[PDB]
């Protein structure tokens, strides 16, 4: 009983959040990853004159 | 910290002589040891080297044959020994503690030296000016040059400035020629490219005046500059 | 290759510091301890010369053995369980005289069950030792063994009670062609645990060494 | 006839060769299989390297031209080396069977004294001991066979044949083959005690086995070197009763061991794995 | 008592709007892209100098220097290029468990089954690496540490508690206690203002560092999980359990985004990492060997097979060189 109060307020507190559309959420993920993909050297492999490795 | 040297004083041409230098403070088994002299009226000159473990062994010409370097890890000493000296091993020798991995600093620290009296294809780094005078609030760039291109196929340059104060021991200023040392103002700064590199001060301030000097690492035996006499 | 060979001089010592040190801790005897509520776990570590994890040094004919008590440390055992893996032997612990408390050595059987028929310990050895047999001789001559063991017949005195102990152990690890289970009857005084420990290991030790060689 | 001969005697070669090479280089490579034990297999593989580099192909010269195309040096040599690589491994292989049986006895007491100081200084006696048996007697010609046919071979320069009077046939022998052979089966007599009194203990489907693998161990190397090691004895001990055909026959039987020994010696996990990461 | 009820309504109001904005999932609007293709990394490096099951590894800021440690009783320094090593320290504790790296370059953390997180600094004017601090006050093994600042650091412990410390003087400035099992795996966020945690529980929890309290909860998983790792944008994570699982969870829409898992995989995830671009997703697994897959169209780009026990860490570079994993084999390799 000591601890269902601390429960009761703690996911009391967790209600209250905006959200988001998932759509827009994915359109967003996707646009980070398509201007980001020119330099990704694991995505598009780049010569070996540039490779430290 | 701390590195104590001894063992000089008068030498009879043609002797013997045994340098002792006695650390404290650190790790002495995990830094390699130079031994490096200084003329009484010229620059500073490269002696001997040698590594962590007593692995690997380095002299210069003026000195293989006649100079023997070893160390003492459970004593923790550091030990030259001299044999047939002639007059030109007049000097006064630094006892320099260094230190190589990925993004050390060699050259850090340097002992306060023993006198040694007698009685009676090398990369050429060369100072454009022997002496400046600079009145102090103003800024200044000083000059080195190289007689070969210093930037490794790795892509660092290895460019060493330092500076010696009236009646000092020297220090480190700047390691591979673009990084500053530790304990040292953020108002010195060093530049260049191959065969020519600039050292800068800007905001000149008291005791900053002395000798400054460029140095090669890039092969064996390591070559010094002249230095160049900021004064007043 | 100017001031990396250096460099290469100091991995190449580290090299060295590190083969070193593998090589003087692979022939030292690591041994881990179990037990269960007041069973006797610390009582076997007073014959012995002697956080989370308690560790114990101890030197016997020359040979070094460390042992790994977990007793403090309470999570879910699933999650580390496998750290242990590797471990010469098992020395587990089970009092004798908790066969009326309170149900005490119902517990204790679940526990050795559970940790007999491990996946890590598939090919582990176990040395059994059983305490508090000085007052388990007594403590049966005024209250019938039947209490723990309903389906139990036969005569209450100490000489078969331990024998049907030390067989009721035996019945629960159905690893019999792979792992060999050491049992011991010990109490407080008469101290002559280490002989058994030391057996124990030197017939592990050997069992490895000729699995080794193609042979077993 | 002659080609399908030739061939197979380059197969063996070339299987002789990879096997050792890839043995060699897989234990010289990788720091984690730099063990005391390893060390007595390594030098295995050196005294069967060379039979792929300096034994082989000149028997295969001398024998394929039916006639041999130096003189009076290279034979000698030839035949100090063959000597010199044969008694190499078989005590090399007599060491690896005294070092399981004393791990399998008392393993704590013998892991504290085995330092690698020792495993050095016992190859090393094992290879000087096999030199001595190969270099000194024959090139100090201490055998010395005596009757026209030996006269006749050692005068002229085509004659690569070996002849041996009685001594240097029984010495040879015996401490080529037969000591070793003694200590090896009586090593490992005493170690199957123990590890028939262990599975017993428990208590016999497990000791197939070691049967099986005591079986191929003893026999891949008995079965190469004794009918060899016999008629050695014999064509000395009467005259008139063994042709040269037989000879080559059992000494080329007794070669192709050597080419065995690296898949029997060396199926330790980590030797898997080092040879996979080596062969890709 | 009414509380139980209460709660549960309050769970299923919780529940009411987390689907009502799941008009469509990731995929449906990911189908349009052109895929990955094939990977085909190949092993540039093997960094082979531990004698015992790696645990934990972390990757430097200027992506040459890494630091990994065993069951041996030592972590140590790779230098990443030249296959160098740095440093070797020995640790007390020899059940290590955790590693992290001080985006400074100066401090690495440890800890184990001891209760115990060492902090020890590289950079000293005596020439060693001695031990700078003992965080000690936790009940439970060290699970996971990450390091925030040059002085501040967040550890996870198999003790349900979470902790936020203050290394300058030793105490718990911010305690998070809301899980009801063990706590398994940490990540910190690009910007260093709030983290996530998995437990034991099969959840997580996002907490505000600041306040010390948990925002948001997430759940989806059936057993144990014990990877997390943040999406280089900072608005999306990735899990990975003993479900033989991984799934990528959005911190905005607040519920499960995709889910990756093949029939052929039967065994857990061990280790989760990202690239820079965010388009392709690392995982390591029990099977000895690790996966590649397109992040966005849930499909197997690539296996890095070159293990022979099960993979135990994993990292990437900030630059996106190339791609560590490091098993119970003992030895661990780089990927390019
Ligand atoms: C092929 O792999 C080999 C590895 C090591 C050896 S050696 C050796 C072997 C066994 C024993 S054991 O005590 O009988 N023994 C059965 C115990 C395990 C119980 C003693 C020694 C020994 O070291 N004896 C020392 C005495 C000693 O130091 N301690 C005796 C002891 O520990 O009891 C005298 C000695 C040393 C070395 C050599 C050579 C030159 C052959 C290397 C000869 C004699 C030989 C072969
Ligand atoms: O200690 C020993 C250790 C090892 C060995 C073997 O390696 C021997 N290898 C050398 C034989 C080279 C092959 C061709 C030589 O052919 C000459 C046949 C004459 C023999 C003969 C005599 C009478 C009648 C018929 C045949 C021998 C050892 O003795
Ligand atoms: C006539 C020719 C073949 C003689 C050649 C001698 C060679 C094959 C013999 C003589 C000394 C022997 C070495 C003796 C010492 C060592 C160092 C040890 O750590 C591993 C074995 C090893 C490396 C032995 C390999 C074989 C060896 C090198
Ligand atoms: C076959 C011969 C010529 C070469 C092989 C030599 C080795 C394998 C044999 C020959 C004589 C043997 C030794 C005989 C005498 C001793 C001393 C004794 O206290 C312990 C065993 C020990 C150390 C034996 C070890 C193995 C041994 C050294
Ligand atoms: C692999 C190494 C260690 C084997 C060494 C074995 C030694 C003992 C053997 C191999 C070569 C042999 C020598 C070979 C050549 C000669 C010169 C000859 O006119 C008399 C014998 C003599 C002097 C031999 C003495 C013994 C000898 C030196």
Same mark, same amino acid.
């Given at each position: 009983?000591?601890?269902?109060?601390k429960?009761?307020?703690?996911?009391?507190?967790?209600?209250?959040?905006?959200?988001?559309?998932?759509?827009?959420?994915?359109?967003?993920?996707?646009?980070?990853?398509?201007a980001?993909?020119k330099?990704?050297?694991?995505?598009?492999?780049?010569?070996?004159?540039?490779?430290?490795? | 910290?701390?590195?104590?040297?001894?063992?000089?004083?008068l030498?009879?041409?043609?002797?013997?002589?045994?340098?002792?230098?006695?650390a404290?403070?650190?790790?002495?088994?995990?830094?390699?040891?130079?031994?490096?002299?200084?003329?009484?009226?010229?620059?500073?000159?490269?002696?001997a080297?040698?590594?962590?473990?007593?692995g *690997?062994?380095?002299?210069?010409?003026?000195?293989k044959?006649?100079?023997?370097?070893?160390?003492?890890?459970?004593?923790?000493?550091?030990?030259?020994?001299?044999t047939?000296?002639?007059?030109?091993?007049?000097?006064?020798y630094?006892?320099?503690?260094?230190?190589?991995?990925?993004?050390?600093?060699?050259?850090?620290?340097?002992g306060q030296?023993?006198?040694l009296?007698?009685?009676?294809?090398?990369?050429?780094?060369?100072?454009?000016?022997?002496?400046?005078?600079?009145?102090?609030?103003?800024?200044?760039?000083?000059?080195?040059?190289?007689?070969?291109?210093?930037?490794?196929?790795?892509?660092?340059?290895?460019?060493?400035?330092?500076?010696?104060?009236?009646?000092?021991?020297?220090?480190?200023?700047?390691?591979?020629?673009?990084?500053?040392?530790?304990?040292?103002?953020?108002?010195?700064?060093?530049?260049?490219?191959?065969?020519?590199?600039?050292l800068?001060i800007?905001?000149?301030?008291?005791?900053?005046?002395?000798?400054?000097?460029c140095?090669?690492?890039?092969?064996?035996?390591?070559?010094?500059?002249?230095?160049?006499?900021?004064e007043? | 290759? &100017?001031?990396?060979?250096?460099?290469?001089?100091?991995?190449?010592?580290?090299?060295?510091?590190?083969?070193?040190?593998?090589?003087?801790?692979?022939?030292?005897?690591?041994?881990?301890?179990?037990?269960?509520?007041?069973?006797?776990?610390?009582?076997?570590?007073k014959?012995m010369?002697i956080?989370?994890?308690?560790?114990t040094?101890?030197?016997?004919?020359?040979?070094?053995?460390?042992?790994?008590?977990?007793?403090?440390?309470?999570?879910?055992?699933?999650?580390?369980?496998?750290?242990?893996?590797?471990?010469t032997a098992?020395?587990?612990?089970?009092?004798?005289?908790?066969?009326?408390?309170?149900?005490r050595?119902?517990?204790?059987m679940?526990?050795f069950?559970?940790?007999?028929?491990?996946?890590?310990?598939?090919?582990?050895?176990?040395?059994?030792?059983?305490?508090?047999?000085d007052?388990?001789?007594?403590?049966?001559?005024?209250?019938?063994?039947?209490?723990?063991?309903?389906?139990?017949?036969?005569?209450?005195?100490?000489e078969?009670?331990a024998?049907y102990?030390?067989?009721?152990?035996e019945?629960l690890?159905?690893?019999?062609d792979?792992?060999?289970?050491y049992?011991?009857?010990?109490?407080?005084?008469?101290?002559?645990?280490?002989?058994?420990?030391?057996?124990?290991?030197?017939?592990?030790?050997?069992?490895?060494?000729?699995?080794?060689?193609?042979?077993? | 006839?002659?080609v399908?001969?030739g061939?197979?005697?380059?197969?063996?070669?070339?299987?002789?060769?990879?096997?050792?090479?890839?043995?060699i280089?897989?234990?010289?490579?990788?720091?984690?299989?730099? *063990?005391?034990?390893?060390?007595?297999?390594?030098?295995?593989?050196?005294?069967?390297?060379?039979?792929?580099?300096?034994?082989?192909?000149?028997?295969?010269a001398?024998?394929?031209?039916?006639?041999?195309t130096?003189?009076?040096?290279?034979?000698?040599?030839?035949?100090?080396?063959?000597?010199?690589?044969?008694?190499?491994?078989?005590?090399?292989?007599?060491?690896?069977?005294?070092?399981?049986?004393?791990?399998?006895?008392?393993?704590?007491?013998?892991?504290?004294?085995?330092?690698?100081?020792?495993?050095?200084?016992?190859?090393?006696?094992?290879?000087?001991?096999?030199?001595?048996?190969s270099?000194?007697?024959?090139?100090?010609?201490?055998?010395?066979?005596?009757?026209?046919?030996?006269?006749?071979?050692?005068?002229?320069?085509?004659?690569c044949?070996?002849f041996?009077?009685?001594?240097?046939?029984? &010495?040879?022998?015996?401490?080529?083959?037969?000591?070793?052979?003694?200590?090896?089966?009586?090593?490992?007599?005493?170690?199957?005690?123990?590890?028939?009194?262990?599975?017993?203990?428990?208590?016999?489907?497990k000791?197939?086995?070691?049967?099986?693998?005591?079986?191929?161990?003893?026999?891949?190397?008995?079965?190469?070197?004794?009918?060899?090691?016999?008629?050695?004895?014999?064509?000395?001990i009467?005259?008139?009763?063994?042709?040269?055909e037989?000879?080559?026959?059992?000494?080329?039987?007794?070669?192709?061991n050597?080419?065995?020994?690296?898949?029997?010696?060396?199926?330790?996990?980590?030797f898997?794995?080092?040879?996979?990461?080596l062969?890709? | 008592d009414?509380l139980?009820?209460? &709660?549960?309504?309050?769970k299923?109001?919780?529940?009411?709007?987390?689907?009502?904005?799941?008009?469509?999932?990731?995929?449906?609007?990911?189908?349009?892209?052109?895929?990955v293709?094939?990977?085909?990394?190949?092993?540039?490096?093997?960094?082979?100098?531990?004698?015992?099951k790696?645990?934990?590894?972390?990757?430097?800021?200027?992506?040459?220097?890494?630091?990994?440690?065993?069951?041996?009783?030592?972590?140590?320094?790779?230098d990443?290029? *030249?296959?160098?090593?740095?440093?070797?320290?020995?640790?007390?504790?020899?059940?290590?468990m955790?590693?992290?790296?001080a985006?400074?370059?100066?401090?690495?953390?440890?800890?184990?089954?001891?209760?115990?997180?060492?902090?020890?600094?590289?950079?000293?004017?005596?020439?060693?690496?001695?031990?700078?601090?003992?965080?000690a006050?936790?009940?439970?093994?060290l699970?996971?540490?990450?390091?925030?600042?040059?002085?501040?650091?967040?550890?996870s412990?198999?003790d349900?508690?979470?902790?936020?410390?203050?290394?300058?003087?030793?105490?718990?400035?911010?305690?998070?206690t809301?899980?009801?099992?063990?706590?398994?795996?940490?990540?910190?966020?690009?910007?260093?203002?709030?983290?996530?945690?998995?437990?034991?529980?099969?959840?997580?929890?996002?907490?505000?560092?600041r306040?010390?309290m948990?925002?948001?909860?997430?759940?989806?998983?059936?057993?144990?999980?014990?990877?997390?790792?943040?999406?280089?944008?900072?608005?999306?994570?990735?899990?990975?359990?003993?479900?033989?699982?991984?799934?990528?969870?959005?911190?905005?829409?607040?519920?499960?985004?995709?889910?990756?898992?093949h029939?052929?995989?039967?065994?857990?995830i061990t280790?989760?990492?990202?690239?820079?671009?965010?388009?392709?997703?690392?995982?390591?697994?029990d099977?000895?060997?690790?996966?590649?897959?397109?992040?966005?169209?849930?499909?197997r780009?690539?296996?890095?097979?070159?293990?022979?026990?099960?993979?135990?860490?994993?990292?990437?570079?900030?630059?996106?060189m190339?791609?560590?994993?490091?098993?119970?084999?003992?030895?661990?390799?780089?990927?390019?």
């Amino acid at each position: 009983i000591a601890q269902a109060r601390k429960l009761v307020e703690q996911l009391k507190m967790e209600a209250n959040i905006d959200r988001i559309k998932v759509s827009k959420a994915a359109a967003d993920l996707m646009a980070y990853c398509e201007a980001h993909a020119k330099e990704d050297p694991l995505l598009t492999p780049v010569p070996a004159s540039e490779n430290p490795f | 910290v701390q590195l104590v040297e001894s063992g000089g004083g008068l030498v009879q041409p043609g002797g013997s002589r045994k340098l002792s230098c006695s650390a404290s403070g650190f790790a002495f088994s995990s830094f390699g040891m130079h031994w490096v002299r200084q003329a009484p009226e010229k620059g500073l000159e490269w002696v001997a080297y040698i590594s962590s473990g007593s692995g *690997t062994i380095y002299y210069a010409d003026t000195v293989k044959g006649r100079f023997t370097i070893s160390r003492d890890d459970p004593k923790n000493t550091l030990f030259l020994q001299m044999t047939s000296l002639r007059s030109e091993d007049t000097a006064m020798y630094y006892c320099v503690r260094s230190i190589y991995y990925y993004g050390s600093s060699p050259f850090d620290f340097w002992g306060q030296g023993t006198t040694l009296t007698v009685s009676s294809s090398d990369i050429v780094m060369t100072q454009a000016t022997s002496s400046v005078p600079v009145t102090p609030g103003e800024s200044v760039s000083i000059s080195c040059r190289s007689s070969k291109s210093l930037l490794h196929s790795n892509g660092n340059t290895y460019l060493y400035w330092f500076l010696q104060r009236p009646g000092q021991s020297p220090q480190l200023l700047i390691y591979r020629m673009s990084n500053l040392a530790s304990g040292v103002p953020d108002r010195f700064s060093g530049s260049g490219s191959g065969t020519a590199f600039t050292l800068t001060i800007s905001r000149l301030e008291a005791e900053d005046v002395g000798v400054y000097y460029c140095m090669q690492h890039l092969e064996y035996p390591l070559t010094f500059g002249a230095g160049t006499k900021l004064e007043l | 290759s &100017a001031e990396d060979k250096a460099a290469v001089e100091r991995s190449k010592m580290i090299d060295r510091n590190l083969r070193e040190d593998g090589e003087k801790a692979a022939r030292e005897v690591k041994l881990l301890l179990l037990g269960a509520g007041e069973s006797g776990k610390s009582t076997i570590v007073k014959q012995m010369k002697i956080t989370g994890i308690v560790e114990t040094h101890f030197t016997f004919k020359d040979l070094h053995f460390k042992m790994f008590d977990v007793g403090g440390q309470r999570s879910e055992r699933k999650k580390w369980i496998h750290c242990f893996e590797g471990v010469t032997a098992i020395i587990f612990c089970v009092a004798l005289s908790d066969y009326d408390l309170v149900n005490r050595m119902h517990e204790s059987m679940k526990l050795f069950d559970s940790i007999c028929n491990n996946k890590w310990f598939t090919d582990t050895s176990i040395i059994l030792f059983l305490n508090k047999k000085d007052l388990f001789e007594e403590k049966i001559k005024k209250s019938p063994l039947t209490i723990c063991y309903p389906e139990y017949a036969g005569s209450n005195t100490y000489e078969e009670a331990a024998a049907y102990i030390q067989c009721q152990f035996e019945d629960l690890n159905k690893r019999k062609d792979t792992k060999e289970i050491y049992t011991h009857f010990t109490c407080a005084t008469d101290t002559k645990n280490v002989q058994f420990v030391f057996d124990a290991v030197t017939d592990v030790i050997i069992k490895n060494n000729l699995k080794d060689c193609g042979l077993f | 006839w002659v080609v399908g001969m030739g061939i197979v005697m380059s197969l063996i070669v070339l299987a002789i060769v990879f096997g050792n090479v890839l043995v060699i280089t897989a234990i010289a490579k990788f720091e984690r299989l730099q *063990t005391v034990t390893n060390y007595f297999i390594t030098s295995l593989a050196c005294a069967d390297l060379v039979m792929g580099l300096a034994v082989v192909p000149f028997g295969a010269a001398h024998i394929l031209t039916k006639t041999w195309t130096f003189g009076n040096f290279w034979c000698e040599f030839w035949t100090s080396i063959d000597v010199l690589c044969v008694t190499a491994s078989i005590e090399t292989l007599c060491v690896i069977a005294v070092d399981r049986y004393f791990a399998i006895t008392s393993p704590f007491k013998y892991q504290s004294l085995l330092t690698k100081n020792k495993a050095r200084v016992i190859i090393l006696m094992v290879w000087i001991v096999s030199g001595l048996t190969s270099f000194l007697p024959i090139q100090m010609h201490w055998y010395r066979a005596t009757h026209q046919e030996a006269i006749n071979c050692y005068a002229e320069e085509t004659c690569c044949d070996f002849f041996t009077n009685q001594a240097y046939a029984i &010495a040879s022998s015996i401490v080529s083959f037969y000591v070793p052979l003694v200590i090896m089966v009586f090593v490992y007599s005493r170690v199957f005690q123990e590890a028939k009194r262990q599975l017993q203990k428990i208590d016999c489907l497990k000791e197939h086995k070691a049967l099986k693998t005591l079986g191929i161990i003893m026999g891949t190397f008995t079965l190469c070197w004794l009918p060899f090691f016999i008629v050695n004895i014999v064509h000395v001990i009467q005259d008139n009763l063994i042709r040269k055909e037989v000879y080559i026959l059992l000494n080329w039987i007794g070669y192709v061991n050597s080419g065995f020994n690296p898949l029997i010696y060396c199926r330790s996990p980590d030797f898997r794995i080092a040879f996979q990461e080596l062969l890709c | 008592d009414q509380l139980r009820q209460e &709660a549960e309504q309050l769970k299923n109001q919780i529940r009411d709007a987390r689907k009502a904005c799941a008009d469509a999932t990731l995929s449906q609007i990911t189908n349009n892209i052109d895929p990955v293709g094939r990977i085909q990394m190949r092993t540039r490096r093997t960094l082979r100098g531990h004698l015992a099951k790696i645990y934990a590894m972390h990757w430097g800021t200027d992506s040459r220097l890494l630091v990994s440690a065993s069951q041996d009783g030592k972590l140590i320094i790779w230098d990443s290029y *030249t296959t160098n090593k740095v440093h070797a320290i020995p640790l007390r504790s020899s059940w290590v468990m955790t590693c992290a790296y001080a985006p400074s370059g100066n401090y690495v953390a440890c800890g184990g089954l001891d209760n115990i997180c060492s902090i020890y600094n590289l950079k000293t004017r005596e020439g060693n690496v001695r031990v700078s601090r003992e965080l000690a006050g936790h009940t439970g093994y060290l699970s996971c540490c990450r390091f925030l600042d040059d002085n501040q650091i967040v550890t996870s412990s198999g003790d349900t508690t979470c902790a936020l410390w203050d290394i300058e003087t030793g105490q718990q400035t911010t305690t998070f206690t809301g899980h009801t099992g063990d706590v398994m795996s940490l990540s910190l966020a690009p910007d260093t203002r709030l983290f996530v945690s998995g437990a034991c529980d099969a959840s997580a929890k996002l907490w505000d560092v600041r306040e010390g309290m948990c925002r948001q909860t997430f759940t989806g998983h059936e057993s144990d999980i014990n990877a997390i790792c943040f999406f280089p944008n900072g608005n999306a994570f990735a899990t990975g359990s003993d479900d033989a699982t991984c799934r990528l969870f959005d911190l905005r829409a607040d519920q499960e985004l995709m889910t990756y898992s093949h029939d052929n995989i039967i065994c857990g995830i061990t280790s989760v990492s990202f690239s820079k671009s965010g388009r392709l997703l690392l995982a390591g697994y029990d099977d000895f060997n690790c996966n590649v897959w397109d992040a966005l169209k849930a499909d197997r780009a690539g296996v890095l097979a070159g293990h022979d026990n099960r993979v135990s860490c994993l990292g990437v570079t900030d630059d996106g060189m190339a791609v560590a994993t490091g098993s119970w084999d003992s030895f661990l390799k780089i990927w390019n």
